[PDB]
Amino acid sequence: GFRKMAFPSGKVEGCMVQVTCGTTTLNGLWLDDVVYCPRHVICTSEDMLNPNYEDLLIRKSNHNFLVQAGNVQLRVIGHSMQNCVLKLKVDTANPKTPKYKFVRIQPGQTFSVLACYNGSPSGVYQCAMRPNFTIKGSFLNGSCGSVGFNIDYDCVSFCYMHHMELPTGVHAGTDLEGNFYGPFVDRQTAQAAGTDTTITVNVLAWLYAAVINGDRWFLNRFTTTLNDFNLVAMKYNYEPLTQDHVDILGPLSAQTGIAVLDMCASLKELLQNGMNGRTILGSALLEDEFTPFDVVRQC
């Protein structure tokens, strides 16, 4: 069938530690001899509205950072800040370090989240970067420093580190170079996410998946132009579909024989009619958290 699978979390579990600074404890990512964690681990609650992190970090000494992997304590021998991520240099390389790289992902892209509390992982789930650069995750207090990743062969690509929960209940974070996804800042001042839209190219990939698994009830005889489609789909809060999106789908189009702009016409009709009580691949809603790359891997 088609289930939203996460990646096996084992390679990431071996990297999670807890980082303590004063009364603050959150999770860090231990790779080689560096521990990475959100820089607000150094913050007090009075500084939260307008923290001066450079001013706060220059006042800290290595021995102020208690880093703990399992039962073991790690000695911090250096520290530096990169954008919104703090990098704590430690005196012993992590022997469980996998092959890895850091990558900045784009809206529509999917990844797995290892939700951790006190450096101990508690669950893993699949997630997508929304077009408004938030993620609809599942995070409790203490989850800061949890990370999102993909696994390709044996290479863990780290793409997200969790920093905060916005007022609307969605989550905001940075890449592993500390740059936020979206217009957010690690400050407790008012900030709001742009209106969230549906990831059109992902919905289409999911329909192609439905056709591959046997389900054709939503297909119609029509075709459309790219500009006719975008004019209709914008009215439903769908992301504009670009010629690049059209190119990304070509393999699935070839595999099923339905041209991309035919499938677009079926999606136009589905938006107009709703499900009429039916389901596609076990869902009564249009699914937008499977990329074209995903569909092919599990189909």
Kindly report the number of other CB atoms within 10 A of residue 264's CB atom.
Answer: 28
Residues 6+ away with beta carbon under 8 Å from 76: 35, 62, 63, 65, 67, 88, 89, 90
214 binds, among ligand XEK, a second copy, none (CB under 5 to 8 A by kind): a second copy
Smallest CA-to-CA distance from 141 within 98, 171, 113, 112 is with 171
Q: Scan residues 236-275 and list those touching a second copy (CB under 8 A).
A: 274-275
Q: Is 40 a catalytic residue?
A: yes
Residue 180, Cβ density class (10 Å: 0-12 exposed, 13-18 middle, ≥19 buried): middle
- Tokens for 102, please give them: 């850091």
Site string for ligand XEK, 11-40 (x = CB under 6 A): -------------xxx-------------x
Residue with tokens 């950072």: 65
Please report whether residue 52 would count as binding a second copy according to CB under 8 A. no
Phi-psi region of 98 (alpha: psi -120 to 50; beta: other; left: phi over 0): beta
Segment 181 to 210, residues that bind ligand XEK, using CB under 6 A? 186-188, 190-191
Q: Exposed/middle/buried for 40, CB within 10 Å: 0-12, 13-18, 19+? A: buried
Q: Does 2 bind a second copy (CB under 8 A)?
A: yes
With CB cut-offs between 5 and 8 Å by kind, which of a second copy, ligand XEK, none does residue 25 bind? ligand XEK
Q: What single letter denotes the amino acid at residue 10?
A: G
Q: Which of 166, 212, 281, 299 binds ligand XEK (CB under 6 A)?
A: 166
Residue 82, CB-side half-sphere exposure with 13 Å CA sphere: 13
Q: Which residue reads 């609307």 in tokens? A: 168
Shortest gap between Cβ of 71 and a second copy (angstroms)?
12
Q: What mask of x and - would describe binding to ligand XEK in positions 124 to 143, judged by CB under 6 A?
A: ---------------xxxxx
Q: Which of 15, 144, 159, 264 is catalytic?
A: 144
Selected from 6, 31, 260, 263, the binder of a second copy by CB under 8 A is 6
On whether the CB atoms of residues 241 and 200 are closer than 8 A, the answer is yes
**How far, in whole angstroms, is CA 98 from its chain's centroid?**
20
CB of 236 to ligand XEK, least distance (A): 29
Interaction mask 166-185, a second copy, x per CB under 8 A: ---xxx--------------
**Which of 44, 64, 92, 122 is close enough to bind a second copy by CB under 8 A?**
122
Please tell me whether residue 125 binds a second copy under the rule CB under 8 A. yes
Expressed in angstroms, the distance from the first to the final Cα of the chain is: 9
Residue 144 known to be catalytic:
yes
Pick one of a second copy, ligand XEK, none as the site partner of residue 163 (Cβ within 5 to 8 A by kind). ligand XEK
Q: Compute the distance between CA of residue 199 and CA of residue 267 in angstroms, rounded to an integer.
A: 13
- Minimum CB–partner distance for residue 225 and a second copy (Å): 30
List residues near ligand XEK by CB under 6 A: 24-26, 40, 48, 139-144, 163-167, 186-188, 190-191
Active site amino acids: 40, 144
